[PDB]
Amino acid sequence: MEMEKEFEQIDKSGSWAAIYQDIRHEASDFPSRVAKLPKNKNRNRYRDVSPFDHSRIKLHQEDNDYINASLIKMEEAQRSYILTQGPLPNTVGHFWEMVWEQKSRGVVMLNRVMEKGSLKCAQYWPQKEEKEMIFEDTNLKLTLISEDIKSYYTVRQLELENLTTQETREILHFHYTTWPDFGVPESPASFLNFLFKVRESGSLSPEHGPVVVHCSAGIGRSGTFCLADTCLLLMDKRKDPSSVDIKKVLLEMRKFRMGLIQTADQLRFSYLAVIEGAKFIMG
Ligand SMILES: O=C(O)c1ccc(N2CCCCC2)cc1
């Protein structure tokens, strides 16, 4: 079926939970043996969210190459994304090592450091120009260059230096600051505006390594971001845009990381975002 009318048919019939459970039942199951090794317990935020072995990002280290991060490679859309958990106190250096090694231009953050009164990820970037951060375990230096605070999101320019080689690179930090503590946003308009700002920066384009996207577990909000981006790109590329099937795209993405889209409300929000976004792309 088309998307917008499938949408009203699920709303009128109140069957979002049943649609979402079907997706969960049909989703891929692949091994995640490296994630579960005892030496990696303090590298995982949640025991039930792990990268598959076949798609995990490897750190360029011989001691321990593990990080909780996955490469989502979308062949028809010609887009790639790295989805990862919010960094932990003992993985902030690994996080920036990955950004460096994978040649990423942008980092997309969809959570606040504290939500619901608890810490959802480490404070992993510097908050003042004159107070830079040094990650001694991976030999990197990170400096805040500029910051632009808007009503729904903040964009930061960061300088990452590889202290071994003295090479430097400019990284863009895109921080969506207004996702509610509970539920999903009422309107997708600010989320779509944010997606378009990431696109306009070059961070999603083939001349750079994959964008790094995270929330707390790296599967819910993060899944919503890449699912909406890929569906809208496919609607522009195909002769028949009404052939784009958001449930099939989501199942393809779940071949590369488990659990993408965590609730039926996130599934409905993803439909809403793609539907509204497809009208703005043209008019
Ligand atoms: O009939 C439809 O459902 C339909 C869906 C998407 C669409 N596009 C137009 C071209 C790029 C943006 C969305 C056109 C038609």
From Swiss-Prot:
Catalytic activities: O-phospho-L-tyrosyl-[protein] + H2O = L-tyrosyl-[protein] + phosphate
What residues does the N,N-(cysteine-1,S-diyl)serine (Cys-Ser) crosslink join?
Answer: C215-S216
Instruction: According to the UniProt record, list the residues that bear Phosphoserine.
Output: S50, S242, S243
Per UniProt, where does substrate bind?
A: D181, C215, S216, A217, G218, I219, G220, R221, Q262
* Outcome of swapping D181A: Substrate-trapping mutant
Q: Cysteine sulfinic acid (-SO2H) occurs at which residues? A: C215
The active-site annotation reads: C215 (phosphocysteine intermediate)
Changing C215S has the effect of: Catalytically inactive mutant; abolishes sulfhydration
Top-rank lineage group of the source organism = Eukaryota
TM helices/strands, residue ranges: none
Gene Ontology molecular function, alphabetical: cadherin binding; enzyme binding; ephrin receptor binding; insulin receptor binding; non-membrane spanning protein tyrosine phosphatase activity; protein kinase binding; protein phosphatase 2A binding; protein tyrosine phosphatase activity
Modified residues annotated as S-nitrosocysteine in this record: C215
Modified residues annotated as Phosphotyrosine in this record: Y20, Y66
> GO biological process annotations for this chain's record?
actin cytoskeleton organization; cellular response to angiotensin; cellular response to fibroblast growth factor stimulus; cellular response to hypoxia; cellular response to nerve growth factor stimulus; cellular response to nitric oxide; cellular response to platelet-derived growth factor stimulus; cellular response to unfolded protein
Q: Which residues carry this modification: Cysteine persulfide?
A: C215
Q: Known EC number(s)?
A: 3.1.3.48
Q: Summarize tissue expression.
A: Expressed in keratinocytes (at protein level).
Please verify whether the record's keywords include NAD.
Answer: no
Please verify whether the record's keywords include Hydrolase. Answer: yes
Oligomeric state and interaction partners are given as: Interacts with EPHA3 (phosphorylated); dephosphorylates EPHA3 and may regulate its trafficking and function. Interacts with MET. Interacts with NCK1.
Name of the protein this chain belongs to: Tyrosine-protein phosphatase non-receptor type 1
Q: Which residues of the full protein are shown?
A: 1 to 283 of 435
